[PDB]
């Protein structure tokens, strides 16, 4: 950030992340993923998107058998015609040069790293039934994936 204003780590007076206006942008590109540390506009966004492709693939090969992590996927609402929908819709097939792609059906679409959400995201399963009801918590979210149709 910048010249910030001065027992438990997580119980101290929480101050806003403050930066000057002179380079409020140069901070932004670094602290887009610095707030994560997860375990010309044409070429720039393309490079960003490819770097996000590599980050997504790293996350997935980091997801291979974890029981607590999650990753919310955003998908087009009116998907390719096959909710009453079940089974093997398609796949996340990784192309060459390190870029990803998704075939939700026969259609082909490209993937994205979504927006950063620097706050805790916990996924629960509400199960309300007449006998008894319970909030089956399952885990926390690690980031969002956006999948957008291409032409």
């Amino acid at each position: 950030x910048x010249x910030x204003x001065x027992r438990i780590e997580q119980l101290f007076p929480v101050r806003p992340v403050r930066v000057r206006h002179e380079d409020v942008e140069t901070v932004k590109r670094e602290i887009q993923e610095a707030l994560s540390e997860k375990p010309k506009e044409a070429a720039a966004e393309l490079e960003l998107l490819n770097a996000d492709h590599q980050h997504i693939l790293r996350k997935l090969k980091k997801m291979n058998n974890k029981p607590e992590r999650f990753m919310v996927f955003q998908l087009p609402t009116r998907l390719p015609a096959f909710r009453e929908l079940a089974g093997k819709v398609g796949s996340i097939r990784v192309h060459k040069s390190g870029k990803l792609s998704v075939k939700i059906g026969n259609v082909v679409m490209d993937i994205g790293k979504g927006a950063e959400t620097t706050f805790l995201q916990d996924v629960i399963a509400l199960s309300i039934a007449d006998d008894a009801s319970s909030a089956e918590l399952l885990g926390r979210v690690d980031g969002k994936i956006v999948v957008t149709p291409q032409i």
Partner: protein
């Protein structure tokens, strides 16, 4: 050049995501501790998530003013609604496969000040109704649905997700040229 299959599952399953607008996603190089949760609440047909995470009276609690102003302030209350949003799915990897379960009514849990509401009510203690008027009238008329809590049970859900995704398989027959006009 490799493949990563996608499985869609949990049609009848109902899932929710919490967004704690109060706790950071990570405070160091590893994710922050999951806040301890106890005594949760919910409302059908009105979709009000209410969560009561107990605070720390050991330090930074200000017991005298806490108890003098508001009687029960042990538990920090988080209140939020769930918003319908299509195209939302939760995912994990089990056997080099990604399993998608649809989410319903994601919530942003803001801090709640129930004790301030009730302390102020005790301070003050001495027709179509359309639109959002009906919303809060419903909220303070048809309410009070308690809801038990159960954390840690993930394996039953995951093995249901895997079971419901190995039995069904179907082919896509609609052309991508018709798909672009179906958006």
């Amino acid at each position: 050049i490799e493949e990563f299959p996608l499985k869609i599952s949990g049609e009848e399953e109902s899932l929710h995501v919490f967004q704690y607008a109060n706790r950071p996603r990570l405070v160091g190089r590893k994710p922050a501790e999951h806040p301890f949760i106890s005594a949760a609440r919910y409302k059908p047909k009105s979709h009000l998530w209410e969560i009561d995470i107990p605070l720390d009276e050991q330090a930074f609690y200000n017991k005298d003013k806490a108890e003098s102003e508001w009687n029960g302030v042990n538990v920090q209350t988080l209140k939020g609604v769930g918003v319908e949003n299509n195209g939302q799915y939760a995912a994990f990897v089990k056997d080099m496969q990604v399993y998608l379960v649809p989410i319903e009514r994601v919530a942003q849990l803001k801090p709640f000040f129930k004790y301030i509401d009730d302390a102020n009510v005790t301070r003050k203690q001495e027709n179509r109704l359309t639109g959002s008027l009906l919303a809060h009238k419903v909220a303070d008329e048809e309410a009070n649905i308690e809801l038990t809590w159960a954390e840690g049970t993930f394996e039953q859900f995951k093995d249901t997700i895997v079971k419901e995704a190995e039995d069904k398989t179907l082919v896509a027959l609609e052309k991508q040229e018709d798909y672009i006009d179906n958006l």
